[model samples]
Target: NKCDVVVVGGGISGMAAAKLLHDSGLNVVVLEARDRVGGRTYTLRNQKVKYVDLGGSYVGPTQNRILRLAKELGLETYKVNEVERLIHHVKGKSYPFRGPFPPVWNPITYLDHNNFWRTMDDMGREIPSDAPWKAPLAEEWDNMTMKELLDKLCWTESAKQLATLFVNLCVTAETHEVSALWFLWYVKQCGGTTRIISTTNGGQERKFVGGSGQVSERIMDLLGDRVKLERPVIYIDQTRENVLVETLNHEMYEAKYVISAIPPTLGMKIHFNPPLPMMRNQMITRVPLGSVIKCIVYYKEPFWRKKDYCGTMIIDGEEAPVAYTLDDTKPEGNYAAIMGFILAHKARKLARLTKEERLKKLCELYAKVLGSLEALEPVHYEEKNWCEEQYSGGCYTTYFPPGILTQYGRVLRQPVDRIYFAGTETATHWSGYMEGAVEAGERAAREILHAMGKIPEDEIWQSEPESVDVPAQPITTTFLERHLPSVPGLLRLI
Candidate 1:
């Protein structure tokens, strides 16, 4: 088969580009490896009604594009349920602080965390809310690690560990492997005005009305016949005669244009005949993805709400049962759900433990905050580990040990031959979230269209598509893995 254009990945980014080109009368066909679209999105259904957000779930205002796209499609959206001011977690024999509702008692514990946040604020003090990367401390901060900053401030071991725990969990990777500079970049993306105060319950939190999949589904609909599923192109050849795509099963097709709307590492699955340029190939080999596991437990009722406990927890470290929790359920005090964020490095150790052990550990953690042991004997629990997924490999994308951003990030986003790159990883702003995904997609489309002299400025959001709900098939087939992908495998593992 042949088309005027081809889009890979079937994600929000791919769908957006396909829609734009197709709307302009190009013969567009999308090739997705997965059986369904919504690349990183997760919506589950088997027998009971259970909700799970595997991919990018939350939507933030200030600089979020996907949320804006959802609104344009008329997809319903709901702000995430309110949470508590103080979060508690268990460690060893005690939880947060020994018995029922005792203060941290360290006398310095509150100021310890607050002081760290204040230091963070100062480092970013010169950063503009609109363009944090443009900050004067860009080079200095970029060269420093988070640990380095903590050491300079002479923080206590306990204080340093606590702050690092929060950062590691949120970054969805290990502490030692992450860049302290990139962490600050995240805060700046939240409008460069964060403090310890910014992390409180209601500071910029959002969830789609139906869920994140609602937004993904609507984008696929906007592409009409142009979007195809279970059609992942395995071989891409950039030839003057025509750009050809060969599926893993050897099915063949051709198109005039192609956009690699996939994580850099996953993009390695496609062989580039002569292979991508040396620099591009090096980039693919080096860019590592952050492993993020979202374990959403569905309970018949809201248990935490009754304890005067907010559905939030800051598990200190390797021992803390869960890293963080958001009260996804309890819309009207009827539903209760816990979304646990698991960092990649440690999850490998936990993923290897027998199922029973993991569950027991989960119970121990819940018992501390939920009052009783039986309150959280969930009817059904779902574990979606992006690290083990063959299609996604891992969550959005994370920076490597060194400066790929300072050195070659520009190349990753630049067009090489007929290949254009678009993914959350390539986005300079909001690098590991849905907001970045949408931003990169728009840039790719505009660049492609402008190269062909299509868009004439200010016509970007000309009009929007109406949203509609369509039933998506439950997963009939999926790749199951026995081994959690190690950090090294994250590099060219396909």
Candidate 2:
């Protein structure tokens, strides 16, 4: 049966697009590859919905879309607990840090903080989120890697190391892996580096009461049977009028339009009939997912919090298995846990280590930072390594390596015939977060609606239509009656 549209993902972005189209009274079917609804929004249920997110979670103040949607969906959130000092571990010793950097420990980082931030803010201002390739310095930025940019800064080796840590944190790749243009564009997406990385007013601020996966689950509840999970879309045959999407099981879905909401690189796994443009193919190929493994350990209570420790640790050791750790304890839920991210090169190295060695190293790191004998043991533990996941190659998000963005960035979102794109990566704001995923979804739905002549072009980006009761009307057997209200003049006819 031919539907108005078929969404080829069940992640936040795909669901957001499907929800918007469905709410607008359009015939939309969401095809999710995994058995689950949320793609990258997996929440490990150590105890039902009362759990920690093993995937994309935190919502910051600047991330408006997801925050609004979560509230609308009746989900609650709380700020991550903050203590007096955040731990900065170096040479196996942890220091108390209250400000941006530990001046006594990493003096270069302290010295260069203001200068580097100012430069990023200034550079970020020149980047147009929607068209970063058109920036005046696009050529230069697109040609250089983050490492090259850091070298250009001419800071001390310690300062560069500090900056490199942030680069890995942001892009989930080494400084030598990402293009300078992509790095600045990322800064612009989050508004600035401080907002992108900070915990107080920034990216790591608040988390949902249930895991972040609840957002997708709630959306799926609203969507009902419109979503079909475990359907991996492997092929897309498109024409000027419609698209035929086929899953790995040989099931076929026909739709007027199709949205590929998977990671840019993952979409390359799907075969196209006429094939995507060369540049589009190159952009898709050039973009790669970041390496990350989220490890969460449960305790009777947050022991470090009792000692006035923030439970936030930045481990800068050569053999540290965990690069970043945060206090993810939900006191309201009576759950005490600490989550750490094994990222990039460190993640690759850690993946090869024996399980016993890995656990021992992590426990040692925890003990070192918390300064407690209790930290060495945990009640339970859970982990999600996106790299090991079949569908999602990696986590955090994807980025352009070295000089690809300027040459092929414009093609990342430009639709081809009846095929559209929606994902956090394609978003103009908060590109690596849930908010960006929703924004991209909404944008794709509007664009498809306008392209199909259902709505005027001017209304493509307008405020969403207020919820209304659409009168029951007779509709074709192939198309669901729920889709009737989206017809161009059907609402007036009713």
Candidate 3:
């Protein structure tokens, strides 16, 4: 074979997979569709400010494996400061809220906040990352939608609807569409439930000192000429004997083993010689992809922090910009920066509108909270409608609709001759996160090694499922009303 292994996708998953496989004494090659590595994890320097993460940026001490990998790879990172104003917007009104690590000294009125969700989050973090599938009550949650989970938590209609806006920003999907089990599992991994209203602690967030791209660049440097850039993998043909990978240029890549680290959405597009198994095929087809649009507004100052405002918001205005925007950028140089974040469901509607309308709406939203338009405008506006990207249909991994997780996770680890599936979404622990990406990459590489007799397969831990909480259900009428709310003015959601 031309190569021992051909890892598809140059994002962190593919890069890490290739690197680990190579280190395992195999000739590895990584194929990236974009012009550079890091995939969605792109970070742009020379922006109006010091540097801004155009992709994934949040990191913390709790992210030990990722942090260790950074050090081992000589990648640099800095602690992200506690962003103060994680405001929540509900029913067209905005509320100022504390963050990650909030003091327990708020008024009883204010105490009635999302912070209460922290207990659930803390409890979740303690669950074993892997085998959450076996978590005693795992199967129970599989039946409910995220909206149901919120209802079980006693969130008000206004709070649940408003929380949809927030979850829409993070998960980039409507609550009804995403699975409650997946959402709960995610919160469990964080050691805090989504109920937490704290953003405080020992630097809970971090960013690459240079940029997210540094990790990609360093990994590629290790591969030398083995990495290809800007060569879009237009088509992929695979077989057990040998595999052929081709791109837009009619470029071809052949290998003995193929490692697909692409998001499950993009991974499904590649054609297999004999075709994938029925379950894998179903996971790709039935699983829903989210519509997420991300925008970054470059600024000339740490304007809000300078004015004692935390870079947070919960505006109910139709503008529907970003739900969370903070100085995630570390101290780079003179000028500080803020952001204009938004979810795809909302951002998609905005993108379809004229730029002037979108801009005017954003300015209005900011003006209502901040002093005026002058305080809100940025040096320039930059945005990406991930749903529009031909390569990546939408944002990173998210909880799909009820029943999708069981359809996927039930047989996630089963292997088909010479092919193994691994991605952030498919990871056993910390799934939907970079750490999970790393863990899955390592796990897949090791699994393949064992299968090939490259390493001995040893059992490290086992699980005994625990009893699950019988999630109290809301009245059927209320559940249906909140879930399939009458879409009067909304577009037909696919």
- Minimum summed lDDT over a 10-residue window in model 1 is located at 469-478
Candidate 2 per-residue C-alpha lDDT over 61-88 given as tens digits, one digit per residue, 9 for 90 to 100: 6677887778789987787766568888
The list of candidate 1 runs beyond 4 A from truth reads 83-85, 90-112, 124-144, 193-204, 330-332, 456-494
The Cα local distance difference test for each model comes to 0.63, 0.79, 0.61
Shift of residue 476 alpha carbon in model 3, Å: 35
Best by TM-score: 2
As a TM-score, model 3 comes out at 0.82
- Summed backbone clashes in each candidate are 3, 0, 27
How should the candidates be ordered by TM-score, best one leading? Answer: 2, 1, 3
- Which portions of model 2 show Cα errors greater than 4 Å? 100-109, 354-356, 462-494
The candidate 3 region of ten consecutive residues with least summed lDDT is: 466-475
Across residues 1-494, which tens digit of lDDT does each residue of candidate 1 receive?
A: 79877778877777767766777777778888887888887666555444456677776444346656777778655555544433655354334322112244453454454455555655665655334446676667656666676666534566677667656655666656655556666655544333211323222255666567766677777776666677777898886578888888667878767778888878788888667887788877777777766676667776666655556665665665577776777344544676776676667767777656666676667666555666448766667668888877777565555344444444677787777777776665565667677776766766667666787756533332322321112212113222323222333475
Highest-lDDT candidate = 2
Q: After superposition, how far is residue 383 of candidate 1 from its true place, in Å?
A: 1.2
